[PDB]
Design a protein around this ligand. Structure first.
Ligand code: DC7
Length: 330
């Protein structure tokens, strides 16, 4: 089998991407945030605290003839931005762009943190990291990709995130018309449950390439590019007037500044992130100070190739017995 679904930025800043997902019988279509950095499929639901719902489409398990309560199972997750959610678990039928998994664990939110509430466009998450990270207790549950994998034509999925444009998540095949040149594959460590890999270095603008190993994760569920303080300092040094702001919580820059591109290495191949991908607009409405799209990972503990980087490439998440990651220019 294969699946293919259009993914859409939630706002003008590409702060996240949503993908329509069908859950239950009859289908309830929710728009989910596909997240290669976590492994829980969780949804706003009829069971979510009323005060914590504001515009989201909700999953109502009582109206799905295929929904079954998973007795005694709970979940609780906290993400890298301080957000969180929790609830109970159903198994139900889930379809993504024509690809169907029966008996998928659908985690129904009882509680959600304020950040989720305030984002009316995201009805929940669909995790695509490794299933060892799933938070369902006392019995861990499998991700959608893990559940679909044996049935797929090929054990892979691809992320094709758009800059200010629609994009695509494919399952089970590689669309060879979606990129230019070749796909360069690189080794993956699953030891932390992530799509974790090692970039071979970076360049700022037209500057010479710096060969240095940068261990990080491919995370569609993170907006920005988080890299070592040294690297980030070298980037923003090339932006006149940029500085690191404690009050704002990162590098900011004059809104009229010209941002240089940022290149990262994949083996001997290079992916180029155009300067304007790194622009996340005024720090507050009407301000002429803008928030930067490349930030230090020093307080995080891990480097994160989030949407800012990934949307500059066609990315293959190869889930063969030994997983690998593929990057191509596009
Ligand atoms: C525009 N960003 C940079 C910024 C920060 C401060 C000022 N100006 C720009 C911040 C944002 N991040 C998000 C999400 O974290 C995206 C995925 N999780 C849900 C919310 C939405 S707005």
């Amino acid at each position: 089998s294969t699946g293919s679904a259009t993914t859409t930025p939630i706002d003008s800043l590409d702060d996240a991407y949503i993908t329509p997902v069908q859950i239950g019988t009859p289908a309830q279509t929710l728009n989910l945030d596909f997240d290669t950095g976590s492994s829980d499929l969780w949804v706003f639901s009829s069971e979510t605290t009323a005060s914590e719902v504001d515009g989201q489409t909700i999953y109502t398990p009582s109206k799905s003839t295929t929904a079954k309560l998973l007795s005694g199972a709970t979940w609780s997750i906290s993400y890298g931005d301080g957000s969180s959610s929790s609830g109970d678990v159903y198994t139900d039928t889930v379809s993504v762009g024509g690809l169907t998994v029966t008996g998928q664990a659908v985690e129904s939110a009882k509680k959600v943190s304020s950040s989720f509430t305030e984002d009316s466009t995201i009805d929940g998450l669909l995790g695509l990291a490794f299933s060892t990270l799933n938070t369902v207790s006392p019995t861990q549950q499998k991700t959608f990709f893990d559940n679909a994998k044996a049935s797929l034509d090929s054990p892979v999925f691809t992320a094709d995130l758009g800059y200010h444009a629609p994009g695509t998540y494919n399952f089970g095949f590689i669309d060879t018309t979606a990129y230019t040149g070749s796909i360069t594959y690189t080794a993956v460590s699953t030891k932390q449950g992530f799509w974790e890999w090692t970039s071979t270095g970076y360049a700022v603008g037209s500057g010479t390439f710096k060969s240095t190993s940068i261990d990080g994760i491919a995370d569609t569920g993170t907006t920005l590019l988080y890299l070592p303080a040294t690297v980030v300092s070298a980037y923003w040094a090339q932006v006149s007037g940029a500085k690191s702001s404690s009050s704002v919580g990162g590098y900011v820059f004059p809104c009229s500044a010209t941002l240089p591109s940022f290149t990262f290495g994949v083996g001997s191949a290079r992916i180029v992130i155009p300067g304007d991908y790194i622009d996340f607009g005024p720090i507050s409405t009407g301000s002429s100070s803008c928030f930067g799209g490349i930030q230090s990972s020093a307080g995080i503990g891990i480097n994160i190739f989030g949407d800012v980087a990934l949307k500059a490439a066609f990315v293959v998440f190869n889930g063969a017995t030994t997983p690998t990651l593929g990057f191509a220019s596009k």
